[PDB]
């Protein structure tokens, strides 16, 4: 497991969702250092954009 999880790892994320009925999709990719506890992500809305609500309700779901 300390083999299979490297000191640097990347990830891919797909979100499908709706807020107050507004459907949307988000595709993203990130990277970080699992054992140091740090990471970055870049997300793009792919359907349903622009979004009528605060991005802040989505951020903890990515992270």
């Amino acid at each position: 497991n300390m083999a299979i999880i490297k000191e640097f790892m990347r990830f891919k994320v797909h979100m499908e969702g709706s807020v107050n009925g507004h459907e949307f999709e988000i595709e993203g990719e990130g990277e970080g250092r699992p054992y140091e506890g740090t990471q970055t992500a870049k997300l793009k809305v792919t359907k349903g954009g622009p979004l009528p609500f605060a991005w802040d309700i989505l951020s903890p779901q990515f992270l």
Binding site: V13, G32, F53
Partner: protein, 159 residues
């Protein structure tokens, strides 16, 4: 993205131990104005990278409140209190979104994390999280985030 939480040696890193199979989670967020967000996620490891699939349903936000009107300004520092229960790892948070009007908008959050195979559960401890939007285009169809997360014992003294 729970695979990236820094843990002390004497606390089992539940999320890392779940791999390569990985884990799932389900989260409920209750906001002070009646807004609700329910989220489920599946985390796995394929082709040497983590793969995340998320579904999100947000309902009952006042069409006139800070979320629908895009009036929030980021999350404060977060402390997620972890504890084992019913074969799974739960996290509870009481946490606020900053508001453009010099104000706060509070949320209670509970998440259940379950590994797809048997993994040792930790006892109670805290995960401290800093979550930042580092940049975005004008309309947030492109956004970049930074997160730092670290488990800390909540009992055990100076030891």
């Amino acid at each position: 993205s729970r695979a990236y939480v820094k843990h002390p040696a004497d606390i089992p890193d539940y999320w890392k131990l779940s791999f390569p199979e990985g884990f799932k989670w389900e989260r409920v967020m209750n906001f002070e104005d009646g807004g609700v967000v329910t989220v489920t996620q599946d985390s796995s490891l394929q082709d040497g990278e983590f793969i995340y699939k998320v579904k999100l349903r947000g309902t009952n936000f006042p069409s006139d409140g800070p979320v629908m009107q895009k009036k929030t300004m980021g999350w404060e520092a977060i402390s997620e209190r972890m504890y084992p229960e019913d074969g799974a790892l739960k996290g509870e948070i009481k946490q606020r979104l900053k508001l453009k009007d010099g104000g706060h908008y509070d949320a209670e959050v509970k998440t259940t994390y379950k590994a797809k195979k048997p993994v040792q559960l930790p006892g109670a401890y805290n995960v401290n999280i800093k979550l930042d939007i580092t940049s975005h285009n004008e309309d947030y169809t492109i956004v970049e985030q930074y997160e730092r997360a670290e488990g800390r014992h909540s009992t055990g003294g100076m030891d």
